[PDB]
């Protein structure tokens, strides 16, 4: 009975997360080259593993401000639902997208023997 | 007089020895082939 009372409470809490985020992604692409409507139409675009995929959508997208050189180069690169259920590894910071590949280049080298 | 010392094996832990009083002793400034290939005076 309180199922969709927790479900809509999340699909709208994620809209609230994307409300302050599409305001921080806007101000970064303005102070250096509404948003809540662009949020509830994208927080419903995913809407357990749901509190996990959301937990992941939270810190990975709200990646700012040096992490918003990879999250700003995604706000000005990625498509609508055609970038949505991506859950990318390198999705983090401009520097974190590469250091993750720097400890991976020896992770296969040390492994193969 | 102080021209020689008797060294116990635990005392050896802070001593530094040269193999020969000349072979490993001065400083560099022809070369014998069949002769042994030893290290150096470095220290």
């Amino acid at each position: 009975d309180f199922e969709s009372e927790k479900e809509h409470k999340l699909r709208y809490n994620a809209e609230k997360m994307f409300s302050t985020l599409f305001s921080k992604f806007i101000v970064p692409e303005t102070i250096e080259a509404i948003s809540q409507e662009f949020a509830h139409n994208l927080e419903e675009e995913l809407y357990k593993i749901y509190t996990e995929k959301v937990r992941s959508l939270y810190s990975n997208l709200k990646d700012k401000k040096n992490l918003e050189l990879k999250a700003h180069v995604v706000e000005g690169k990625l498509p609508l639902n055609k970038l949505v259920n991506m859950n990318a590894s390198e999705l983090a910071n401009p520097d974190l997208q590469e250091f993750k590949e720097k400890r991976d280049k020896i992770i296969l080298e040390n492994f193969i023997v | 007089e102080g021209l020689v010392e008797y060294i116990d094996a635990e005392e050896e832990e802070s001593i530094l020895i040269a193999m020969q009083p000349e072979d490993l002793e001065p400083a560099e400034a022809d070369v014998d082939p069949a002769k042994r290939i030893r290290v150096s005076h470095h220290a």
């Binding site: 999340l10 996990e52 939270y58 983090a92 400890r103 991976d104 296969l108 492994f111 | -």
Partner: protein
């Protein structure tokens, strides 16, 4: 390797970390205990905002914060969410988890529980590292690849 995929390089690349025994001991640098009497607010500044994220979207006065190594984690290829849900389903409903994600540089997993708890929380970290298996079958250690 499984009948079909004989020369498949990537097949062994999955089975390897899926068979190799990973511990919380492997991925952890230091496990600390603080005194945070409030469930919501965290007196830790190195965690001050980390909470406000995985919170908004009754509970123990004794905090169990532990730092992780980014290379040692992204060695068996890991997520803080993986580690987080792993421990979550280990203790289950008696201990609740919060963490900083892979985006956040301060690699932390904060933990609490539900008279006397200084010794009882200090007791937990013992079983936590040694017994919490994270990846692969136990005993089966050094998984090395051969062509």
């Amino acid at each position: 390797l499984e009948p079909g995929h004989a020369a498949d390089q990537e097949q062994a690349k999955l089975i390897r970390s899926a068979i190799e025994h990973t511990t919380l001991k492997s991925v952890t640098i230091a496990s600390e205990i603080y005194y945070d009497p409030d469930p919501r607010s965290t007196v830790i500044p190195e965690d001050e905002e980390i909470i406000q994220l995985h919170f908004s979207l009754q509970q123990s006065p004794w905090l169990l914060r532990l730092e992780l190594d980014r290379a040692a984690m992204n060695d068996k290829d890991l997520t803080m969410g993986q580690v987080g849900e792993r421990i979550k389903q280990t203790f289950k409903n008696d201990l609740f988890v919060i963490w900083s994600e892979d985006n956040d540089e301060k690699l932390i997993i904060r933990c609490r529980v539900v008279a006397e708890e200084d010794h009882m929380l200090k007791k937990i970290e013992n079983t936590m590292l040694e017994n919490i298996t994270l990846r692969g079958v136990e005993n089966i250690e050094r998984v090395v690849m051969m062509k």
